[PDB]
Design a protein around this ligand. Structure first.
Ligand SMILES: [Cu+2]
Length: 639
């Protein structure tokens, strides 16, 4: 199940309008309180007019609207189930503006929801863009609108939340499709659950930022239920999904052909492991005792060229284990892995002990010292985040998490780790005064300007429960070594939530739950628009445009020349990300040194070390003097 974020508004004085309604299935049958009566558009003798179909409500009075619910027909028939939809709010019933929520609902008879940020309105409109099974009709058994206890206008300069993207699944795992710019998401064998899996199936859903279209696909070709996996984007640009519900499987997503290809089985069966793309384009993985059994799972490496997995038994997992109360089942999970120089992989945590992993021969491991500062030794930070915001300077920001995976208090601990050469112990310091809010199960992304956006989580880790939620996101600004609170949201994002940086510079935050009959399933996502996209007047700022690029494929050490429509002051390369269970080993940022050729013509060199400039797809962002970024131009980097 799921749940609304607000309280049901009294429907006694409501006036409703529908584009069409069959006799016996009147527009008002959707607000009569009878679950067995429904509104249904024209059919039979009246003909079968295709979508869009609309349901408009006049609430007579202004309400602080934060959602709606839609109960479909409960008679066992599927005709009219709403698929793609849009929700609009208004104060006059004439001017509707932009949708406060849009997307698609799953094809079943369960109550569907649209949860969004509070907005005062008198009129509500639900537009059915498509029927769930492509049929011409629209039907609704019961429709309700919800309200918050109050409304507080967002603070100027602290970004904005909205709109909500309604989904047919809980997006517990996600990635940005490089060549299409779409957000790929997946759950498990079911749209709302993972338990009781027969294996061999994954339900996926994609959202296109340019069209707003949500599409789905059931993946069975790879014979893999991709829930709880390791995720990496290889040197060629294929998404390598490993283990999970089907512990020994590897599934490959190809962006260019928009298809899933069967990959080679891993040498060891794993679940909850972290995988990381290397300097040579290969993928390294270690640990992962959630599935496949609880035992010593050392490293192994994937080669995209030969489509093989090879064991690296001497790349020992023992040095990176946390002291989790639940033991090995949890202690080898979600390592903070980063591909580095000469085929090495840095492990920043969650364990206090940081390590260097080597991939030559049968593998090796070397101690990199303990994550610490002048404030003391950092405790184990399970499900804490780690973000490489400046790969050129080897800067990694780590924050949050708890000593144990569950039933443990999260902390405000935050550190800055500075990587040097492989085998050397990196210098580590405390980041500012730490987080404003202690949190675990939170997610994060590095933004074009080098700042790190942190959102969601809870003060005490209790998987599948929406207790002690943190609604206020935080942004770390490196130049000032300061954290800044942003405008809060209204949807709890805890266990099974994700965050990814979109090609337009905004943040996609969603998921949470995936517990079947629980009421904590969140079949949605929200868009966060950072302050850098707004001008002083509170309106969306004019963005600089990249009018031309010399090439879209470059080798490390190579140069790229661009043309713009206006003057730019700064530029950066951000590697496309992947995300699940707080892990994102693909994203990283490279600040660029620009050469002004005169006028609106610029050049830059991609770092020569492929350990810094990890091969694969990257987003090119250019910022003007005001700090407003352009939309991303896609660049492929090779070693
Ligand atoms: Cu999980």
């Amino acid at each position: 199940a799921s749940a609304p974020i607000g309280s049901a508004i009294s429907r006694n004085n409501w006036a409703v309008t529908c584009d069409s309604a069959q006799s016996g299935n009147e527009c008002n049958k959707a607000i009569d309180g009878n679950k067995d009566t429904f509104w249904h558009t024209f059919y039979g003798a009246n003909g079968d007019p295709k979508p869009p179909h609309t349901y408009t409500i006049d609430m007579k009075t202004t309400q602080n609207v934060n959602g709606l619910s839609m109960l479909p027909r409960q008679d066992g028939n599927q005709n009219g189930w709403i698929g793609r939809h849009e929700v609009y709010l208004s104060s006059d019933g004439t001017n509707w503006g932009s949708p406060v929520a849009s997307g698609s609902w799953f094809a079943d008879s369960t109550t569907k929801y649209s949860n969004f940020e509070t907005r005062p309105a008198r009129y509500v409109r639900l537009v059915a863009i498509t029927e769930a099974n492509g049929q011409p009709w629209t039907s609704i058994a019961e429709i309700n609108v919800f309200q918050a206890s109050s409304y507080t206008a967002p603070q100027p300069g602290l970004g904005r939340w909205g709109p909500t993207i309604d989904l047919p699944i809980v997006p517990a795992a996600a990635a940005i499709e490089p060549t299409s710019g779409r957000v790929l998401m997946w759950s498990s064998y079911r749209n709302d659950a993972f338990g009781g899996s027969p294996g061999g199936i994954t339900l996926t859903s994609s959202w296109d930022p340019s069209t707003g279209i949500v599409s789905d696909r059931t993946v069975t070709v790879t014979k893999h239920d991709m829930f709880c996996p390791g995720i990496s984007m290889d040197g060629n640009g294929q998404i390598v999904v490993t283990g999970g519900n089907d512990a020994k499987k590897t599934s490959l997503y190809d962006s260019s052909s928009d298809s899933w290809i069967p990959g080679p089985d891993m040498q060891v069966a794993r679940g909850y492991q972290s995988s990381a793309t290397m300097s040579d384009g290969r993928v390294f993985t270690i640990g992962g005792s959630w599935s496949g059994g609880v035992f010593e799972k050392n490293g192994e490496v994937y080669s995209p060229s030969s489509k093989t997995w090879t064991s690296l038994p001497n790349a020992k997992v023992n040095p990176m284990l946390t002291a989790d109360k639940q033991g090995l089942y949890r202690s080898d999970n979600h390592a903070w892995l980063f591909g580095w120089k000469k085929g090495s992989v840095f492990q920043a945590g969650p364990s206090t002990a940081m390590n260097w992993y080597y991939t030559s021969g049968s593998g090796d491991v070397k101690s990199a010292g303990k994550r610490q500062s002048n404030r003391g030794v950092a405790p184990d930070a399970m499900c804490g985040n780690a973000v490489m915001y400046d790969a050129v300077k080897g800067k990694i920001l780590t924050f949050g998490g708890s000593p144990d995976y569950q039933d443990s208090d999260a902390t405000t601990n935050a550190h800055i780790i500075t990587l040097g050469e492989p085998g050397t112990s990196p210098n580590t310091v405390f980041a500012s005064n730490g987080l404003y809010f202690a949190r675990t199960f939170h997610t994060s992304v590095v933004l074009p300007d080098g700042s790190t956006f942190i959102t969601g989580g809870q003060r005490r880790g209790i998987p599948f429960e929406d207790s002690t939620p943190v609604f206020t996101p935080e942004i770390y600004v490196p130049e000032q070594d300061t954290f800044y609170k942003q405008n809060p949201n209204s949807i709890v994002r805890v266990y099974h939530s994700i965050s990814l940086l979109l090609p337009d510079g905004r943040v996609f935050n969603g998921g949470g739950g995936l517990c079947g009959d629980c009421t904590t399933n969140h079949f949605d996502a929200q868009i966060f628009t950072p302050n850098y996209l707004y001008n002083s007047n509170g309106n969306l700022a004019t963005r600089p445009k990249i009018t031309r690029t010399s090439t879209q494929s470059v080798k490390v050490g190579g140069r790229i020349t661009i043309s713009t429509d206006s003057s730019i002051s700064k530029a950066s390369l951000i590697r496309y990300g992947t995300a699940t269970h707080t892990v994102n080993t693909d994203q990283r940022r490279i600040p660029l040194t620009l050469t002004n050729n005169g006028g609106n013509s610029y050049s830059f060199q991609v770092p020569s070390d492929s350990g810094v400039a990890l091969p694969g797809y990257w987003m090119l962002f250019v910022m003007n003097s005001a700090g407003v970024p352009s939309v991303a131009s896609t660049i492929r980097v090779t070693q």
